[PDB]
Design a protein around this nucleic acid. Structure first.
Lengths: 52, 128, 187, 122, 179, 160
RNA sequence: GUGAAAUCGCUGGAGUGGAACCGGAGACAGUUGAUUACGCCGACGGCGUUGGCUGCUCGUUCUAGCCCGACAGUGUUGCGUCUUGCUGGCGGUAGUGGGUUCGUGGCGGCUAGCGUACGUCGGUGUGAAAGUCGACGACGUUUCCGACCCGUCUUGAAACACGGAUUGCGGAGUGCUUGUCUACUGCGAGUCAAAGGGUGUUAAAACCUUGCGGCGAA
RNA sequence: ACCAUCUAGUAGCUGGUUCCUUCCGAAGUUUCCCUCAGGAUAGCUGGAUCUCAGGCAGUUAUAUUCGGUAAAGCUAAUGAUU
RNA sequence: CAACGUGAAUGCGAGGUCCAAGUGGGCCAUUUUUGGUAAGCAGAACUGGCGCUGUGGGAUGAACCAAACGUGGAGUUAAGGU
RNA sequence: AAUCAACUAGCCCUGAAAAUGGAUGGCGCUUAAGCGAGAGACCUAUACUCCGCCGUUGCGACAAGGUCGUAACGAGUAGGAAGGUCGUGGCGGUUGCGUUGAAGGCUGAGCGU
C-alpha cells in the first residue's frame, strides 16, 4: 500500500484559477530595512524643515 | 384556446407528467417526482433515451400560465360573500365552489352567481 | 459553446433594506425615487447607506460633528449622516449644528438644541435639499470595532499585531511559548 | 508585427484572410451589430453609428466601411464598436478544418480566398 | 500534408527575392514554375523550394509576382516528359515518366494520379524536377509510343452500359457487343 | 528527494566563464548604485559573501537600500498564485546595472526634448509613440543586370 | 367505527415466437368541450423574417485560339532541297474570338418554416339528444427511434463487488453550556440588570423597583 | 460460566442519512504530526457584501537580460578507445 | 513651489475585508523521461482530459475524433459517412 | 526485332501453428461494395445562424416586497447559497366550512417546470 505519490499536476491550474496576483505599487514607499544611520539623519532633516 | 380577453394561444411545452424513475418497477416508489441523486444514475447523467428531468426551460408562457382550457383562471369561493372578488374581472376569472360547501349553501351560491353573471366550474354538483 | 466564465456574473447587492422597519423601508423608497429621478450621486449614496447593514454604520461623535462644522465654510452647511449621533463627554463647547440623521441620542440632541442647533429627519432633508446642496456627509469610524481588532494576519505569524481569542487576561493565558524569547521563540 | 504573431499562435483554430470591398460591405450591412453599453444592438440605421463614432467623424455605415478598409486613424474605435460578427455555417460545407489551407484544409491564412469563404458564410 | 487536390492542377509562374539588406543592397531575383491547386499553395511551394535551394526563407524574402499560365493551344495533342524525384517507404528515387495530353498542367495532374496509383506515393513525397514536350521519336515508353501510329484502329470490346434515370428492373436484354 | 542545501545544482550557474577567472576588475566597485535603480543579479562565484540565492540569479530587481559595500533589492518571486516582492541584501560583485530602464529614460528624455523644441519653434506636436512595424509599402524592382534565374528542384544523388 | 397497500378469485375486453417494464412521435379505442358577428379548426392569396434550389445578362483580372509572316521539325495524303497535311516556339492582331476571375453589379423562375401591413372562403357551435366539429388520449393496444438495476465505496459498476422477495407504519445533524462571525431590534459612554422586594386573582403571566453586580469606558 | 448494572462503553472503520426548482461550483497537491484508511495547515470553492470608476492581462511588440538541454566538439582541457 | 500633460498593440471596469464547506486513494493521453526483459507495471515534467459529462462518429468502450447541454422549430455544418 | 544482366518498390503469394462455432460489425463485394490519387452532389449533432417561449445575470423605465423593457447567457459530482401562494404538526391571532355530510379512503376534468 504505497502512499508517497507526490506530483505537481493540477497546481498551475489552481494557481491561475484566480489569476496570479502581482505585487502592489506602494511597496517601494516604505523605508523598512533601510540603514539606521540614514533613517536617523532623515528623521532629523524632516523634523527641522520649516513649513513656510 | 385563446386567453379570455386576449388573442394569445395557450401552448403546452409538455403534456406528460415527470414520473419518478423506477416508480413503474417498484410499488413502494411513488410516481411523484424526485430528483435522482445516485452517483451512477443514468437518468441523472442524462443518457439518451432516458426520461427528461424537470427544468425551468419547460416553464409555460407567463401570459397563459395558470389558465384553464376554457380561457379563465380558477378562483375558489366558499360562500356568497366570496363571489364579490369575482365581480370585477368576471371576464377572466371563473368561480369554483369549495369541496366543503354543503348542498344547503351551494344552492344559494349558484343562484347568486347566476344573478351576478359569474361562471362556475362546478355549479351543477352536489344536488340533493 | 462560448468560452466565458460565469463565476463573477452575479454581484451580491442590497436592493432594499433587510430590516422590516416600516419607516426605514419608506425612507428607502423615497430616496430610491429621488436617486432615480434627480440622478444625483448624493441621493445614490444616501440610498446605499439607508440599505446598508448596521455594521457599516458605526456611531458618530458630537465631537466629530462639531469639528466638521467649525471648518472654514462649513458653518452653515447641513451635516448629513446615517450613523447614530452620540454625545461626547470630553467635548466642552458645542457649536451651532444643523444635522439630518436617522437617530440622535438624548444627550447629543439636548446639547445640539441648547447650543442653538437644529435636528431634522431624512425626509425633511429631502424637502430641504432634494439634490443634497450645502451638505456635509459624515459617518462613524467603520474599522473601530473589537471584532475588527481580531481581523488580519494570524497572531502567531511574524510582524502581526492581531488580537487573539483568549478566555481571559493574565500571565497564565497565552503568554509563554511563541511570545517571548525565554520560551522557544518570539514572533 | 504586433498582430501577426498572434495570428501565428492561433493558426490552427482560425481561418483568416484579406477582405475586399464586397466582403466588408456585406459584413457591415447584413450582420452589423454595435456594442452600446454592453448590449448587442443591430445597426439598422446610420444614427446608431453616429451616436458612438460621431466624435471621430464616422457618421454612416459607409464611413465605418471606409475606416475599416483603409485602416484609418480610428480603426481601433471603429472595430471595437462592432460586436464580433456571428456568422452562419457556409452553404456547401468545409473541407478539413484540421489541416492548413495549403494542405487542402481550412485553417490558417487563405489570403484573398477568405472572400470566397465569406460569400457562403455570410 | 501537401495534397494535389482539384482536377487539372493549375500552373503558376512565381517570381520572388530576398529582402534587400545593407550588406546586400541588390538581391538576385528567382523564378519558378509551380503546379498547384491555387496561388496560395503556389506561393507556399515556391518558398519551400527556394528555401531548399538558397539561404532564404519566407520571413526574409518577398514575392515580386504570382501569375497563372494558360496553355497556349489546347487544341493540339503533345507528348510530355516529366522528371521527378520521390521518396518511397525505404529510399529516394528519380523517375522519368511520359504522358500524352493537350496541356502541361493536365500532364502533371496525370503524373500525380499515376504515381498515387502505381507507387502509393502522395503529393508531399514527390518533387517535379522538370516537365517538357518530347518529340514522337524521342519518346521511350511503350504505352505512349504505341499511340504514334497514323493507322491506329481499335474497337470497344465489352461495353457495359449503365442505365441512368430508369427503374432498376427491366425486361430488355443487355447487349455488351456493338459491331 | 533532493537535498535542500543553499548551493545545490549551481555547479555551472555559480562557475566563472572560461578564461575569465581570477581578479575582479574594479569598475564593478566604481559603478554607482542609487536607491530606486534597477539592477540585474548574476552571482559571482569568486565572492562567497553576500551571495544571492540561486532562485534570484538572472532576475532584475529594484534597489531600496545602499550600504557600505552591498545593496538591498526588491525582487519578484513566484510562489503558487502570488508574486512576492522579496528583499535581499546582495553585495556589489553580484550586481550589474540594468539597461532596459536607462533606455526607457533616454527615450523619455528625447520625447521631452523634441516636444519642447517643437513647441518653442511653433511646429505641431510631433508623434511620440512607438508603432509596430507596418506592412511593407508599394515599390518597383528592376531586372536590369538582375535577370531572374529559373530554379528547379535537384535530383537525388547517392552521397556515399 | 373507518377499512388503505402488498397478495388473491371472478366476469368482460385486448395482447401473447427465449423476459417484462420505460422515454420520444403518431394511429386506434376511449374521454371530454362547442356563443351578420364571435368561438374551435382547415384551404388559398398578401405582407414581415430566416431561408433552400435554379437560371440569364453586363462588366472586371490573367490569357489565348481562329487569322497573317519567316524559320525548324515530321505519327503525313497525292505523285523526295516535291507537294499536301500536321506540329513547335518566334513575330504580328486588323477582324473574329472563347477560357479563367470575381463584382459595395442588373434581371428573373420554383419553393419551405415561423409570425400575422391583412384579405378571400369553407366546415362546425347557440333548447335537447343524435350526428358533426375541436382537443386530449393519461400505467389500454399497435407501430418507428432510443432504452443494461437501483443505492453505495471506488480511478473505474450493468457487473462474475456488497444491500435490496413484496406492502403498510416507525426511522437518523438534536438539546444545552461556552465562543466567534454574520443579519435584525432597542438604547448608546453607556447598556443589561441577578438574586430579591412591591404589586398582580383571566396570580407561574404582566407592571414597578438596584450607592452596589457583569461587560465596556486604559 | 451465567444475570443485572456501569452502558446509548469507545471506534481514525463498515452501512444508512427522508421535498422541488434556481445560481455558483471543486480536490486528490504543499508543510507538520508514532503520520501512511486519520488530522491540522496552505491551496482550490460558496456566501455576505463594501470602497471606488484605468490599471490590469496564462496574448503580442520594443528594449535589456538569465540559462548550458538539443545540436556541435574531442585534429581544445578530463576520462575512455582502434 | 512653477512649467510641461498620458508616450507600444489588443482586450477589459477594478480593488478590499470577513465567515465557512468539501477535498487532502486519483486515473488516462501527445511529447520528454527514470527503474524494469517487459507489463492494461512502478516513478516524474508541461498541457489537455475522465473523475464531475451528457451529445454526433469510431459496430461495442471513462479517456479516441468532433463538439460541451434551458425547452421547441427552420436552415447549415464538424468528425464520420453515402 | 528487340534482347541480356544486376538492382529497385507498388499490389499479390510463402514465411504465418490452439484448443465451444464466429467474426473488415454482419450480409456480402472481384473494370469492387478492395488498394492509391482525385471530382461533383448528398446525409447527419444537445455544434453554428435565425425564430418563439422559460428562467438567471447586467442595465434601465415606471408612484413598487411590484410590473415592464432590453442584451447576453443556461454542463455538473463533493459542496455552498437563494426562492418555494411545495408539504406536515402545534401555539398567539385572524378567515371560513360542516349530520343538506368533516377528517380518512378509492378514482375522472384540470392547474403547476
Amino acid at each position: 500500500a504505497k502512499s508517497k505519490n507526490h506530483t505537481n499536476h493540477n497546481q498551475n491550474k489552481k494557481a491561475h484559477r484566480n489569476g496570479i496576483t502581482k505585487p502592489k505599487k506602494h511597496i517601494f514607499l516604505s523605508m523598512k530595512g533601510v540603514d539606521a544611520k540614514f533613517i536617523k539623519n532623515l528623521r532629523f532633516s524632516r523634523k527641522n524643515n520649516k513649513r513656510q | 384556446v385563446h386567453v379570455s380577453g386576449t388573442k394569445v394561444k395557450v401552448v403546452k411545452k409538455k403534456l406528460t407528467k415527470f414520473k419518478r424513475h423506477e416508480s413503474d418497477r417498484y410499488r413502494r416508489v411513488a410516481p411523484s417526482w424526485r430528483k435522482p441523486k445516485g452517483i451512477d444514475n443514468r437518468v441523472r447523467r442524462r443518457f439518451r433515451g432516458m426520461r427528461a428531468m424537470p427544468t425551468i426551460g419547460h416553464g409555460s408562457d407567463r401570459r397563459t400560465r395558470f389558465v384553464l382550457p376554457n380561457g379563465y383562471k380558477k378562483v375558489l369561493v366558499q360562500n356568497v360573500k366570496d363571489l364579490d372578488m369575482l365581480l370585477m374581472q368576471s371576464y377572466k376569472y371563473i368561480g369554483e365552489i369549495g369541496h366543503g360547501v354543503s348542498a344547503k349553501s351551494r344552492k344559494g351560491i349558484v343562484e347568486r352567481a347566476a344573478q351576478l353573471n359569474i361562471k362556475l366550474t362546478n355549479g351543477n354538483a352536489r344536488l340533493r | 459553446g462560448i468560452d466565458i466564465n460565469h463565476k463573477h456574473d452575479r454581484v451580491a447587492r442590497r436592493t432594499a433594506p433587510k430590516s422590516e422597519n416600516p419607516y426605514l423601508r419608506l425612507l428607502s423608497k423615497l430616496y430610491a425615487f429621488l436617486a432615480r429621478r434627480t440622478g444625483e450621486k448624493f441621493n445614490a449614496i444616501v440610498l446605499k447607506r439607508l440599505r446598508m447593514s448596521r455594521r457599516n454604520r458605526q456611531p458618530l461623535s458630537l465631537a466629530k460633528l462639531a469639528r466638521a462644522v467649525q471648518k472654514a465654510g462649513n458653518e452653515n452647511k447641513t451635516v448629513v449622516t446615517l450613523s447614530t449621533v452620540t454625545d461626547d463627554a470630553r467635548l466642552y463647547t458645542v457649536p451651532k449644528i444643523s444635522v439630518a440623521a436617522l437617530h440622535v441620542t438624548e444627550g447629543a440632541r439636548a446639547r445640539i438644541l441648547a447650543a442653538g442647533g437644529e435636528i431634522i429627519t431624512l425626509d425633511q432633508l429631502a424637502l430641504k435639499s432634494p439634490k443634497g446642496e450645502n451638505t456635509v456627509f459624515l459617518q462613524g469610524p467603520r474599522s473601530a470595532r473589537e471584532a475588527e481588532k481580531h481581523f488580519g494576519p494570524a497572531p502567531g505569524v511574524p510582524h502581526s499585531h492581531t488580537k487573539p481569542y483568549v478566555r481571559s487576561k493574565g500571565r497564565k493565558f497565552e503568554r509563554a511559548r511563541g511570545r517571548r524569547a525565554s520560551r522557544a521563540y518570539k514572533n | 508585427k504586433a498582430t501577426l504573431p498572434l495570428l501565428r499562435i492561433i493558426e490552427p483554430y482560425v481561418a483568416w484572410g484579406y477582405p475586399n470591398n464586397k466582403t466588408i460591405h456585406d459584413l457591415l450591412y447584413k450582420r452589423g451589430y454595435a456594442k452600446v453599453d454592453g448590449n448587442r444592438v443591430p445597426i439598422t440605421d446610420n444614427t446608431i453609428v453616429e451616436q458612438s463614432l460621431g466624435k471621430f467623424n464616422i457618421i454612416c455605415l459607409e464611413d465605418l466601411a471606409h475606416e475599416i478598409a483603409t485602416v484609418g486613424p480610428h480603426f481601433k474605435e471603429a472595430t471595437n464598436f462592432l460586436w464580433p460578427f456571428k456568422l452562419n455555417n457556409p452553404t456547401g460545407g468545409w473541407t478539413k478544418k484540421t489541416n492548413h489551407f495549403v494542405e487542402g484544409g481550412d485553417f490558417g491564412n487563405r489570403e484573398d480566398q477568405i472572400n470566397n469563404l465569406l460569400r457562403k458564410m455570410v | 500534408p501537401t495534397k494535389a487536390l482539384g482536377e487539372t492542377l493549375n500552373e503558376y509562374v512565381v517570381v520572388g527575392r530576398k529582402i534587400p539588406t545593407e550588406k546586400e543592397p541588390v538581391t538576385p531575383i528567382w523564378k519558378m514554375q509551380i503546379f498547384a491547386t491555387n496561388h496560395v499553395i503556389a506561393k507556399s511551394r515556391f518558398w519551400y523550394f527556394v528555401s531548399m535551394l538558397r539561404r532564404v526563407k519566407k520571413a526574409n524574402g518577398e514575392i515580386l509576382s504570382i501569375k497563372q499560365v494558360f496553355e497556349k493551344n489546347p487544341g493540339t495533342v503533345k507528348n510530355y516528359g516529366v522528371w521527378l524525384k520521390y521518396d518511397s517507404r525505404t529510399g529516394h528515387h528519380n523517375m522519368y515518366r511520359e504522358y500524352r495530353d493537350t496541356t502541361v498542367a493536365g500532364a502533371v495532374t496525370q503524373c500525380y494520379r499515376d504515381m498515387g496509383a502505381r507507387h502509393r506515393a502522395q503529393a508531399d513525397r514527390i518533387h517535379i524536377l522538370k516537365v517538357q514536350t518530347v518529340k514522337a521519336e524521342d519518346t521511350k515508353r511503350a504505352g505512349i509510343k504505341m499511340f504514334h501510329d497514323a493507322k491506329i484502329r481499335f474497337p470497344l470490346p465489352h461495353r457495359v452500359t449503365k442505365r441512368k434515370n430508369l427503374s432498376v428492373f427491366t425486361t430488355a436484354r443487355q447487349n455488351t457487343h456493338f459491331a | 528527494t533532493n537535498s535542500k542545501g543553499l548551493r545545490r545544482g549551481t555547479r555551472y550557474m555559480f562557475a566563472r566563464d572560461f578564461r575569465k577567472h581570477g581578479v575582479e576588475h574594479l569598475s564593478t566597485y566604481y559603478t554607482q548604485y542609487k536607491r530606486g535603480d534597477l539592477v540585474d543579479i548574476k552571482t559571482n562565484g569568486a565572492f562567497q559573501k553576500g551571495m544571492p540565492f540561486k532562485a534570484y540569479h538572472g532576475r532584475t530587481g529594484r534597489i531600496f537600500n545602499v550600504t557600505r559595500g552591498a545593496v538591498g533589492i526588491i525582487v519578484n518571486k513566484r510562489v503558487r498564485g502570488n508574486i512576492l516582492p522579496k528583499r535581499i541584501n546582495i553585495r556589489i560583485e553580484h550586481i550589474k546595472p540594468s539597461k532596459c530602464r536607462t533606455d526607457f529614460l533616454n527615450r523619455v528624455k528625447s520625447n521631452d526634448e523634441k516636444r519642447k523644441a517643437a513647441k518653442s519653434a511653433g511646429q505641431p506636436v510631433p508623434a511620440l509613440k512607438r508603432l509596430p512595424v507596418a506592412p511593407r509599402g508599394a515599390h518597383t524592382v528592376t531586372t536590369q543586370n538582375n535577370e531572374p534565374e529559373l530554379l528547379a528542384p535537384l535530383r537525388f544523388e547517392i552521397v556515399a
